[PDB]
Structures are given as C-alpha cells and as structure tokens.
Amino acid sequence: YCLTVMTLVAAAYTVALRYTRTTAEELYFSTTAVCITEVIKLLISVGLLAKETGSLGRFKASLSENVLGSPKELAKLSVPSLVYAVQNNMAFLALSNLDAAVYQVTYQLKIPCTALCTVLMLNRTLSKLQWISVFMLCGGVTLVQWKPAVVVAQNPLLGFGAIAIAVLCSGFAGVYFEKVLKSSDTSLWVRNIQMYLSGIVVTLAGTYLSDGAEIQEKGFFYGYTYYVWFVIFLASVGGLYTSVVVKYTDNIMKGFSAAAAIVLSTIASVLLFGLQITLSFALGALLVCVSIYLYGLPR
C-alpha cells in the first residue's frame, strides 16, 4: 500500500501542479498551497497519534510530554521545516516555468545529494560498489522519467535555479529528519507533529513576506480550483508517506524503492491497460533493477 500510494502520488503530483500553473486565467499564490499542505499533514498526523496511543488520555499525555514539554525537539525540527518550506516552494516555482518531464529528470539529482548527506550526517558508509549503484539508479530514473515536451510567461533559467535549490534541500532536510527520528524511541507521528507545527509558521510567514501585499488585494485562496486542492491533497499524502518510508528503511532506500515502484507500476499498466512505453524507460528500468541488486550485496 505505502509504495502504491507513493507512486500514484508521484505520477499525479508534478503533472497536476504543472497543469494548475499553466492553464489558469486567475492564478493562485503557490506559497499558500505549501502552507495549507503542512496544516493538512499536521491534522492527519494528530489523527494517527490518537490511533497509536489508542486512548484520549494517552493521546493528551503524549502531546503534553512530547510537544508541550519538549521545546528542544521543536527547536531542532524547525530547521528541516525551514528547509522544506524552501524546497516545497521551489517545486511550485520550477513547475510554473518548466515542463514536467524536464522537472522530473533534473530533480533526480536529489538521489546523489541524499546519499552524500546520509554519509555525512548519519555516521554511515557506502562502499565503492554502493556508490556505483547510486549513480546507476540516478541514470536509470533519468531514463525512466525522460519524455518529449504554456500560454503564460515562462523563465526556464529561474525554473532550473529552483530545482538546484530544491535538490540541496531534499538531501539535507530529509536526512536531518531521519537523524532526529532514529535518535530516540519517540513516535513517528510525534516527530511529524513537532515538525509540521513549525512548518505551518515558517510557510505562512513566507506567504506573508512573498505575497502578503497582493493577497491583501486579491485574497489568500484566490485562484483555487478543484485541481489546486488535489495538488495539496497529493502533497500532504506524499509528505506523510515519505516519512513512513524513512522510518522503515532510510533516505537512500527511499530512492531505490520509489524507482522500483514507478518501474513495476508502469509495467503493471502495460499488461493491464495496453500502456505504451519508450525505449528510454525500458533501459532505465533495467538499470534500476541492476542498481538495487548491486546496492543490496554484502560489503
């Protein structure tokens, strides 16, 4: 489930966002969408904590001990919510100015970034062969995501600037979260709540500083459609399910498992629906398989 959700959210997210940024007459403030995403994720996470603790009194006691009585954990997790506030805003900026396939292949540089961050920040080591597999994975997903190519003004350079910022943000903020997540036995859903609390503040502050003037003229939810809420819904689910993947595996295995899932789900749709694929995909898929194999060997 957690990988099938992740992919059908991976596929639909960048396409739906790209669409909402290029077809609109009345155009929404994307800083707001990023803020609303943190709110929704906070709310699902609060829901999930009540299920896990399994009681109103245990739920309340957990928020007391782990939010109200853990200010240093909030302080720490404000850093990656600051970085994710930039990352997530950069994604919206990139897809406003670039083709979705051109966004997809470029954003895959997060994979080497994330590996280097893991090695540096989590006190971990990757063999010569494990490093080889990471670059092969990156080259494989590059080929998997490659495809042919608005009535709005566009700035490809600005689009590529934003992907460079988001790639750096992805490696750093993801690995910072994992470090904090795996440093104690504290619940995943506490960590998410601790984080999304600051996320709501930082994201809302960014909205005010970027688009505050024009929002006072036009309104917070100006330009919002059924498709803008779909993008927010997908970002929220993808965000939460990214955190679960980090809990049960890690930020490096997130790349291999996401790559594997896109390959297998596309292969499933070839056989079930007669979906047509490229030669690039077929080769990309084979390198994703080999990379997973190589990565998983004894050192």
In the chain, after which residues does the backbone break, taking C–N over 2.5 angstroms as a break? 149
Residue 206 lies near ligand C5P (rule: CB under 6 A)? no
For ligand C5P, the closer of residues 28 and 177 by Cβ is 177
Residue 29 lies near ligand C5P (rule: CB under 6 A)? no
Residue 206's nearest CA partner among 92, 298, 122 is 92
Residue 281's nearest CA partner among 144, 86, 163, 133 is 144
Residue 66 lies near ligand C5P (rule: CB under 6 A)? no
Contact call for residues 254 and 245 (beta carbons, < 8 A): yes
Closest separation between CB of residue 107 and ligand C5P, Å?
Answer: 7
> Is 196 annotated to bind ligand?
yes
Site stretch for ligand C5P (CB under 6 A), options 126-134, 208-216, 239-247, 286-294: 239-247
Site stretch for ligand C5P (CB under 6 A), options 19-27, 126-134, 210-218, 235-243: 235-243
Site stretch for ligand C5P (CB under 6 A), options 17-25, 233-241, 276-284, 289-297: 233-241
- How remote is the C-alpha of 36 from its chain's centroid? 15
For ligand C5P, the closer of residues 1 and 273 by Cβ is 1
Spatial distance between the Cα atoms of 179 and 191, rounded to a whole number of angstroms: 11
Write the CA distances from 186 to 36, 62, 94, 246, integer angstroms. Answer: 26, 10, 35, 15
Number of separate helices (H) and strands (E) present in the chain:
12, 0
- Which of 84, 92, 256, 281 binds ligand C5P (CB under 6 A)? It is 84
Residue 106 lies near ligand C5P (rule: CB under 6 A)? no
Which residues contact ligand C5P (rule: CB under 6 A)? 41, 84, 88, 110, 170, 174, 177, 192, 195, 235, 239-240, 242-243
